[PDB]
Subunit: 254 residues, 6 copies
């Protein structure tokens, strides 16, 4: 591999919590050169269709700064035509966060998750999910400490990683080159207890077999468990009660 | 099941080719009440980034009429803010069509695929892919018959189907109700020779196991093979040469 | 004429009701190669400015699929700048439908008419009006049969046709060629009892006389009456009470 | 009539040329309280589809200031969703201007007509057409005087007026009240020699007869001829050669 | 100077009130060839965030017609992407008008100011502010005369002018040429009693000293006082009570 | 002051260069809780209107993340209507950067500056300018070190700060509270040698005197010089040749 990494090896991972002051939860996660600021803010309101249903909500906003993959990713602002890529990814991150939380116990308020990619070199949506969880868990713990809510209704850890087939090799966590050169690539969103929340496999003008898929899904779940072992170092949990550990940052031994 | 269908049973399927006159290929496919007009038009031009690269292209447009799921699906026209759902699906259909075709041999021209959902009751994007293939194959055969191209560079059949977990039951080809009530749902895009082109599994606030995924992927691939046995009745192929059979319509025995 | 049609002769006309299941009324009408799916759906609500005024409403949505006139008509979706043509036509269809219905007796609900041009070869807006009426009448009859409303408040049939001056010849129902080559062209919307609902005559860089207009309006009203004789075969009316006849399709003898 | 005007009587008309300095032609026309600034600017270029075809072009832009009909007409600027009304009208004005000019002899340049309604009380699109002609004629005369073009290729005068049926009375040139209260209303665009360029009659939930249409078209053509007698006082023409007369303003005796 | 004007000399100024009938206040102001229609309309409502706060509001809309600086300024209508220039200026005009008025005493209604540039040759936003004040004062006087409000809560006159450094010369009120050629340029908004409401100085790729700024601010305040001496001829004020004088127009001796 | 800061005292300032790897220049600057990521990327191209003019260009993009002032600042992406605030600020930052650089010597390429506010508590546009300069200087030094350009054509340092009048007190560098409570507020952009690049003073429904302006401009220029003394610690300059110093971060003693 271009960087000298094994085929079943993650890039150097780093998760820093309390990155910013204002959001209830926030962090800067990085998978190699891919860097994402993930923040979680509580809005004391709910989407109209939920009003009165004794439940809370989580929704996400994703944006890539114009300096992605050392190129130009001019945001949707001073442009006009917004892309469906951003929405596909925003919908994914929202689905991951809500699966990890028992919204019944959050109350009628919304956790607004913002993922801001400040440097892109592949796996940005998987870095974003992994980081967004840390920010959501932190924000729920913060709401609890403030007395806004009774417990910390977090069901389990959530992380994500990419994997793919490149020159007939199955690689874990692809950077931008490996991915533009991939025959097949996929994103997997797994949980702390080994289950799956989401999996998308796409043949890029190449088809694949159910067995190749399984081979990739197995390699991905291993990556997901390594990222989750990192996230775990940031919390102290017991009987569904979550407290932050004393770490402000965690990184892989790589 | 609400309709009295088995759990591993497709709804009544129908594929009608030559639905319209003007497009090089066209058909009206239906999975139950879900109905989609799929057309394929040749534009004698290529996207700027391809110009000169001795290759052709296929891209898709998807639109849902305002009377979907017996509700209101007001198109993006007299509205303003276009959704990322449409783009996610348009990107999927394009990926499926290009995997099935050797674009090298199409020449510098584009096959513009249009999928128009005229009635929606779930599985609309999978009906669209299944129908779009018929229209693309027909359009390539038509281009050949006209002498615009030498051969009929179609690699293999492509079809798609949905499957999901509803009240802990794994069901094939979900209608709109079963899907809004699903714990997990997925779309699978397979090929004629049993391979896979795409698979997306989404936990809808529920997580799932690798084994449940496999169980679903197995049921889906069976559905894909039944839809492809139907598509097959519409062509007579030998050594990579494609001709239309004499059927103008094909339907399942259901 | 290119097709061998007389100068005062309509193309082959066909109207098929019950085209789709979900809408309260629906049909597929065709004037030659021009084909339009017209559906009518009841939305149990009214536009804010009407709320409380003991009346119902009818409004229309028109869209041309990207394969019009065997060319490219990329909808307003994945584009951005919506055209005034579509709105001009949507406003026309709405005006025609409301003239034909006593909205007082529909109740505070809206009949949402959707006209989807699936193949264009001229006269598409006139085919749409002619077909939209069938779908609206059917939807009102359906609402009555369901007991949502007391009577079937339909005032009279409504149909429309184009006519024009081409190489100093006055032709009825123009296809796309004749129209792009026309010196003057017009669209006329008439009723069952011989009256007019709308007439638009446009000199296309040529001016015309009041007498030429009358000559054209006379030829148009004859076309309108032939289309209405067709629509009539689809209903059995007596003293303002409307029931569908047993025909599911009607076509001209041409 | 509310203002004490006869039924076949125009409101006080006023046309002032040379309203502004910069445009090649410009004027401020007024039909009662309806006031429109019409300007005509020459852009030394042509629309891409015309390039090389030895011809010029005329296109129009229409805008209503936010203080129309003593209400609020917030332009499309700081808004977002542009209306089809504006485009319908812009297309009309363009069609009227091009019918009046032999574009062959203008050269490859464009006359950009701008109609800015600074006060609206009905008949604004007909005031705009009437005024736009004066500005176009002036701009063509100006181009000739400058030597940019050989002759003054103006075919004939063009003017427009509205008429309608209100409480079963046929009225000429409707103000905003009479028009919102009208059963049928129409706009007619006629030429200097008595011919027609455009006519649009719309039943506003009322139908009408061919005879009523003729009655209205006759009253309109009389109005068109009165407006054109005014426009005529502004030019001195002979054998197709146009010069401005010495009037800077013309008004009706009313 | 190109026009033969002194360096500390305004162009010919003209302010005409009662330009239009419908708005409560209106005028046509001109600084040389720069011409702006400024109108002020009362909307019997307030912005949602003010509702109930016993106060009124003033907001402005600015638009440049397509024939600005004898070029093309195609409005935001039939375009799509609205510019930040317009908003910057609209925000400025609003700030100027609200500083001049005691909104407490206007009641819960809004004065909607519209500035329509019908000819541009520099200083258009400063002409607009100067003219908008006249229209706002007139509209408040009009509301008083109608009994809608008790007093005429106008705090003081407001006017604005531009100034700049061109080839190391400090010039007052720049036309379009002088401004595109300027090293530094600024807009100043002053009041009747000699105070300032706004000042923006921009180095156009050149920097300047605090002293040069003061030199420019001094020249500007003199220009502001001359424009205000003109505005003053249009009112008769005593103890905070405002009445219009008998002038309908005022111009400078120049 | 709320934070215990003197009236003529900046908040704690921090500038960190080499914040990210990919951009040619980049930094994270902070004025208190206001934090901005400023990056500078070289695009090997120029805006069409410059092509061939032997010059380079600098343009800026500004965006505020949705968690500004501990509230909601949903970017223009998944929205639709872009604000003029962003453009006003983007235009300012561009003007500041180009004043500081001799574009003649950059070659036909563009330095694309991106300012991403990741936390807002007032003075965000002034923090952005101050930080953007560091990123631009670094990017020009980087281009030189790579041999893309001969020299380092940087004319002088550029920084900016806000100041205002709050309860009749003149305060330097306002946070969000002080600013929403200000009677007058201003932004000043100064250079390394004591000159000015830009100054905007706005009365917020209060007017001010030329003397108050000067008092504020004097306090601002002192703030600008303190920020520039910080920036200076990051470079080693001699005879127009710029090299980075060994500091990767600089902060104020506060």
């Amino acid at each position: 591999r271009s960087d000298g990494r094994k085929e079943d090896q993650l890039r150097p991972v780093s998760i820093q919590r309390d990155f910013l002051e204002y959001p209830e939860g926030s962090c800067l996660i990085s998978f190699g050169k891919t860097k994402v600021i993930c923040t979680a803010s509580v809005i004391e309101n709910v989407p109209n269709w939920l009003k009165g249903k004794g439940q809370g909500w989580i929704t996400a906003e994703y944006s890539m700064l114009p300096r992605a993959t050392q190129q130009r990713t001019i945001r949707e602002s001073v442009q006009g035509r917004i892309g469906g890529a951003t929405h596909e990814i925003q919908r994914m991150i929202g689905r991951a966060m809500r699966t990890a939380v028992e919204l019944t116990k959050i109350g009628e308020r919304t956790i607004w998750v913002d993922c801001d990619v400040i440097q892109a070199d592949g796996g940005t949506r998987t870095a974003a999910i992994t980081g967004a969880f840390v920010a959501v868990a932190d924000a729920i713990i913060k709401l609890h400490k403030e007395g806004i809510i009774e417990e910390t209704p977090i069901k389990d850890f959530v992380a994500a990683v990419s994997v793919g087939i490149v020159n007939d090799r199955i690689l874990l966590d692809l950077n931008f080159e490996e991915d533009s050169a991939a025959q097949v690539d996929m994103n997997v969103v797994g949980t702390g207890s080994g289950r799956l929340s989401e999996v998308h496999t796409m043949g890029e003008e190449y088809s694949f077999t159910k067995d190749e898929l399984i081979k990739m899904l197995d390699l991905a779940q291993k990556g997901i468990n390594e990222l989750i072992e990192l996230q775990k170092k940031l919390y102290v949990i017991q009987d569904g009660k979550w407290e932050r550990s004393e770490l402000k940052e965690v990184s892989s031994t790589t």
